[PDB]
From a paper:
To gain further insight into the function and catalytic mechanism of the S. aureus c-di-AMP cyclase DacA, the soluble catalytic domain starting from amino acid F101 (hereafter referred to as DacACD) was expressed and purified as N-terminal His-tag fusion protein. The S. aureus DacACD protein displayed the expected globular fold, with a central β-sheet made up of 7 antiparallel strands flanked by 5 helices (left). While the L. monocytogenes CdaACD protein was found to be a tetramer in the asymmetric unit (although dimeric in solution), the S. aureus DacACD was present as a symmetric dimer, with two protomers interacting via the backbone of α3, β2 and the loop connecting α3 and β3. At the interface, residue N166 from one protomer formed a hydrogen bond interaction with residue T172 from the second protomer and a van der Waals interaction was formed between residue P173 and residues N166 and I165 of the neighbouring protomer. Further analysis using the PdbePISA program revealed a total buried surface area of 1450 Å2 at the dimer interface with a ΔG (int) of -8.3 kcal/mol and a ΔG (diss) of 2.1 kcal/mol, indicative of a strong protein/protein interaction. In order to condense two ATP molecules to c-di-AMP, two protomers need to be arranged in a head-to-head conformation. However, in the S. aureus DacACD dimer found in the crystallographic asymmetric unit, the active sites of the protomers are outward facing and hence are too far apart for c-di-AMP synthesis. In addition, analysis of the crystal lattice did not reveal any symmetry-related molecule arranged with the catalytic sites in a head-to-head orientation. Here, we show that the S. aureus DacACD protein is a dimer. However, based on the data presented in this study, we suggest that this dimer is not the active unit per se, as the protomers are not found in a head-to-head conformation.
In the human pathogen Staphylococcus aureus, c-di-AMP is produced by the di-adenylate cyclase enzyme DacA, which is thought to form a complex and be regulated by YbbR and GlmM, two other conserved proteins. GlmM codes for the essential phosphoglucosamine mutase enzyme, required for the conversion of glucosamine-6-phosphate to the early peptidoglycan synthesis precursor glucosamine-1-phosphate. We determined the atomic structures of the S. aureus DacA and GlmM enzymes and show that GlmM readily binds to DacA in vitro and blocks its activity by masking its active site. Specifically, our data suggest that GlmM blocks access to the active site of DacA and in this manner prevents the formation of catalytically active head-to-head DacA oligomers.
Author numbering:
A (entry chain B): 111 to 261
B (entry chain A): 110 to 202, 204 to 260
Amino acid sequence: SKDEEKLIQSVSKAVQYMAKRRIGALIVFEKETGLQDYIETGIAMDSNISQELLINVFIPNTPLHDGAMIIQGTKIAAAASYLPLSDSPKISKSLGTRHRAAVGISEVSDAFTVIVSEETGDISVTFDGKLRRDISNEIFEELLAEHWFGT
Amino acid sequence: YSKDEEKLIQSVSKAVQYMAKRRIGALIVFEKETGLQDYIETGIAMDSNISQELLINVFIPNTPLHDGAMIIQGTKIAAAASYLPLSDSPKISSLGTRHRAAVGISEVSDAFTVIVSEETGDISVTFDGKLRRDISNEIFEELLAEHWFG
């Protein structure tokens, strides 16, 4: 749908902007597994999605930057949520807490999560327990549409 | 006021105090009877719940959302980075852009607006064409409760 396409672009442009600036980001998209428990660890927003708000949330040294944004349908449910951290040895001891968090939530839920690395600006995603690293902008948009909306 | 109303008041007050200390300019408009939809539509739509954290995040300098007014409708943030009209009054023009904007919206609406000065951290409010400068935290909370929740 047209409105779904608008939302994919909003998220994609935000993720691309943060990747360019090497702004760390962690955004979880709820699917079938209810994430209310993790949402309640963060700051409740129930906010509409925009490129501008997504970027604002993750600006370094701001109250909402640390932790995960969790999106439920067309709304931002919360920011600065605490995800569990994976103990997988596959996660290079080099990789930061955000990656461990993204894999962590993917181990205990069917959520689709995007991570922007603050070191490299690489875009990665997790789902079904596995980190998929350093994907292109075009592939991120394709996977996001698939997992978020099923389009 | 209800406990929930009380919590909202505290959320806004704490955010304003935080920004004041750090000399972060802020401009928050509380809609009353005059509909502000036209101004809301110039901003970035949010329809978000209110927290101290989100209010601070919005006004961080050099972010997309800091450049304009936050407009609140009931218990929700309708929009950020909204345009407000600048006051036409010569006598009022003498102060800066944010304050002239706060006076301006109060001249064409019954809205209640709070401004934090970037220069001094002073808290000021506007209502009914009137500007009240450098008010205490306690007076701010009293006035906000009256205007926001009746």
